Amino acid sequence: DLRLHLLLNTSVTCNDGSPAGYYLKESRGSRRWLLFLEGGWYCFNRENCDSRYDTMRRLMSSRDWPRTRTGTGILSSQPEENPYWWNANMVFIPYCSSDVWSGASSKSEKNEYAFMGALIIQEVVRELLGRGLSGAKVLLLAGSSAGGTGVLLNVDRVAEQLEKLGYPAIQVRGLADSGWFLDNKQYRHTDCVDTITCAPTEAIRRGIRYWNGVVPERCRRQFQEGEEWNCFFGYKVYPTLRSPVFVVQWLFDEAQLTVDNVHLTGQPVQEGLRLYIQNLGRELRHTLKDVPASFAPACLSHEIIIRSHWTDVQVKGTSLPRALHCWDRSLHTPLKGCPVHLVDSCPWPHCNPSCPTGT
Ligand SMILES: CC(=O)N1CCc2c1ccc(Cl)c2C(F)(F)F
Ligand SMILES: *[C@@H]1O[C@H](CO)[C@@H](O)[C@H](O)[C@H]1NC(C)=O
């Protein structure tokens, strides 16, 4: 179990003004710290956020949070479930800002909701320093889905935060799971009327203005004022980052296909949709060609690293926990039989036999 701690700074809040927080399971004598960013889509206007508040309220409020959570996958403390960092200090940061961890806006007179995702991360790091993070040697900022994109948006700010607070020895690194999306065209066009089927570009363009979202500085300097939505897309923001970032992404990510208005029905796949799915797989594969630390299996799925069976998937015979361990060694010339760049080359969902079954 990880134990809940609500933030002492109650100005840093979830959407509805309730205090944000984090779940912590300490490991004394370990200088490794894993801070995981939960995912869970987003909402980019009052109408959609109101709907999210009656039926997905735990993603917008801490009022009903349990006082403990069980660590799973990379957050598990059992070596059997987590061969990678089973002995690390475990932190699970709940996603309650609906802003892809980008917001820096307080609830106010003029704002019905607070979007403080970027400030929640900064405040968690600040309050953890008094609980042992000051003695850390590696801080791995991880996250899945919207949390994976949040890693790309915030990993360098965490590094700059610790540097300015006087902790230059803490190595900040990023692990982005299932947050590497493409601003491609939809298979069938919709007008952006709701969340899940809104095209990627239009959803973020509306969200960043609604949340007062912040992006990494160097990426902001490239795309400049009004075009900061570009920095939510991994292949554009990754080359501007300086912290080492390991990228985990299914080649045929289900959330990517959802915003692309692709609904795989079990029905026969016609030529047009077959070419679309195969071309989507190529575009990931191409966008990851120059990403030295990456794990990209050819599967139709979504999220990996906190699933209890995340150890099962392999690319070229290497599991993700092994690839991450190889990444650790590389950050001490390639290593003999311990690879870090693992991108499937086969063109169709589940051509890798180790893909998740969905059972
Ligand atoms: C489920 C989720 O969290 N998704 C899916 C679409 C998406 C997410 C997160 C960040 C971004 Cl940036 C995008 C986008 F479509 F805009 F690419
Ligand atoms: C609480 O957080 C806000 C926003 O990050 C900051 O401006 C303020 O100084 C913090 N309060 C304390 C007491 O640290």
UniProtKB/Swiss-Prot annotation:
The active site is at S145, D253, H302. Keywords: Glycoprotein, Hydrolase, Phosphoprotein, Secreted, Serine esterase, Signal, Wnt signaling pathway. The keyword Metal-binding does not apply. It is found in: Secreted. Induction: Up-regulated in hepatocellular carcinoma (HCC) with high intracellular beta-catenin. GO terms for molecular function: palmitoleyl hydrolase activity; phospholipase C activity; protein-containing complex destabilizing activity. Its EC number is 3.1.1.98. Belongs to the pectinacetylesterase family. Notum subfamily. This is Palmitoleoyl-protein carboxylesterase NOTUM. The lineage of its organism: Eukaryota, Metazoa, Chordata, Craniata, Vertebrata. The gene is NOTUM.
